[PDB]
Amino acid sequence: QLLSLIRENQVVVIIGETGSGKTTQLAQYLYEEGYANDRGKSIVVTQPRRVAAISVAKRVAMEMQVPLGKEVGYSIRFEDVTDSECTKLKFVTDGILLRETLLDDTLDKYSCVIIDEAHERSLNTDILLGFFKILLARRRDLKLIITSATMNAKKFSAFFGNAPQFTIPGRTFPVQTIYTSNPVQDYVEAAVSQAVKIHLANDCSSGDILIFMTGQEDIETTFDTLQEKFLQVDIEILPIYSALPADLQFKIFQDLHGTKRKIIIATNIAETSLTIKGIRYVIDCGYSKLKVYNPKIGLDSLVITPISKANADQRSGRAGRTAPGTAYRLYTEDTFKEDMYLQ
RNA sequence: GUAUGUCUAAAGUUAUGUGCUCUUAUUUACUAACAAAAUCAACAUGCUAUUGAAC
Numbered sequence: 373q374l375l376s377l378i379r380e381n382q383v384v385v386i387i388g389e390t391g392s393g394k395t396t397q398l399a400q401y402l403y404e405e406g407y408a409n410d411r412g413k414s415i416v417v418t419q420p421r422r423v424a425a426i427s428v429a430k431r432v433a434m435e436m437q438v439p440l441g442k443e444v445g446y447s448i449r450f451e452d453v454t455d456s457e458c459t460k461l462k463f464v465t466d467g468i469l470l471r472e473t474l475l476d477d478t479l480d481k482y483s484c485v486i487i488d489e490a491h492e493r494s495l496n497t498d499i500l501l502g503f504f505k506i507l508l509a510r511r512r513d514l515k516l517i518i519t520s521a522t523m524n525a526k527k528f529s530a531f532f533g534n535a536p537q538f539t540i541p542g543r544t545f546p547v548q549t550i551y552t553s554n555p556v557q558d559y560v561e562a563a564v565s566q567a568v569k570i571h572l573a574n575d576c577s578s579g580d581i582l583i584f585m586t587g588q589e590d591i592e593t594t595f596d597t598l599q600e601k602f603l604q605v606d607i608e609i610l611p612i613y614s615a616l617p618a619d620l621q622f623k624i625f626q627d628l629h630g631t632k633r634k635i636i637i638a639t640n641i642a643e644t645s646l647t648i649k650g651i652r653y654v655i656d657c658g659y660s661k662l663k664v665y666n667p668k669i670g671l672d673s674l675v676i677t678p679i680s681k682a683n684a685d686q687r688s689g690r691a692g693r694t695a696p697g698t699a700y701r702l703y704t705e706d707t708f709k710e711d712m713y714l715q
Numbered sequence: 716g717u718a719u720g721u722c723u724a725a726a727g728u729u730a731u732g733u734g735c736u737c738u739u740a741u742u743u744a745c746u747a748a749c750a751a752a753a754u755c756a757a758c759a760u761g762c763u764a765u766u767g768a769a770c
């Protein structure tokens with residue numbers, strides 16, 4: 373059905389769920405369907421992250437059983453791994469593709485483009501949405517695929533001429549959601565309070581916790597606070613933030629014992645840049661440190677602001693990866709309904 | 716300078732048609748005509764500034 377829908381439409385929007393495995397599969401499906409060869413020239417897939425493009429290129433090259441660069445390859449800033457100019461499947465950053473549109477606007481070395489993780493709505497992504505909407509007039513033969521999340525698939529479709537959505541199920545577990553019955557006074561203090569409750573109202577085995585927080589200084593004060601509560605009354609408590617040195621970032625992926633509980637206290641890095649196994653519990657504070665440019669003053673502001681409904685759901689879907697789970701939201705339903713914007 | 720005013724008790728009918736017992740003001744406290752032109756006695760012996768999420 374996928375490889376037929378792309379035959380009968382030049383543009384497709386795809387809701388791929390977490391357990392669809394979309395990113396590795398569809399690229400192979402379309403190459404095997406034939407476009408990627410000298411018939412059409414290469415496939416490109418954009419990513420927003422450098423490390424994503426390389427990791428999925430390694431995975432798909434190994435699923436295709438080829439040395440990376442030779443038929444599956446990648447091209448990112450500082451690093452082009454394509455052993456032939458005619459490398460048939462090419463994973464890239466959206467910025468690299470955008471750079472190439474300047475030197476060849478028709479992109480004639482490519483038959484198909486996949487915009488992966490386009491729900492992240494990067495500057496390069498958003499630009500390429502307009503650029504492709506115009507360029508596909510200038511090339512009927514250029515096939516275009518846009519990945520989407522459920523908040524925006526209709527919106528993406530309508531922009532792209534109301535062209536068809538396709539929704540794939542994924543192998544994802546249910547997460548129970550719990551709003552707080554009131555606004556919290558200080559979310560840091562509720563976060564440690566609920567962390568001890570989930571940790572010790574259950575016995576300490578077989579279910580790890582992720583806690584979302586707004587920044588390093590806030591986060592570092594939290595570990596200190598939570599260790600003491602155990603010593604008053606086993607638990608392993610770990611940080612993650614982008615400024616954290618990579619050796620200490622890496623150890624969070626390594627295992628924990630039976631009877632002991634892992635708990636992870638995190639920035640928005642754990643929404644999307646990093647993926648953790650065995651988390652069954654989430655605590656969401658409902659705020660984030662969003663950069664907004666004020667053009668009148670010419671001034672960036674890093675504001676602790678309410679998150680979006682989409683972002684809340686993304687935090688909620690961190691539990692439910694490995695097994696059924698729970699998300700506790702430090703805010704009300706009505707604040708999610710009105711005070712949080714949708715996208 | 717603790718306003719002041721009015722009322723009534725009248726007369727019956729004026730002849731016709733003792734216990735108990737609190738109290739360190741625990742008071743429903745009351746009056747304003749009186750006076751108001753308040754400043755010597757001030758003030759310590761030497762002046763400060765601080766931390767961002769993520770790609």
Ligand SMILES: [Mg+2]
Nearest residue numbers: 716718748749
């Ligand atoms: Mg007088």
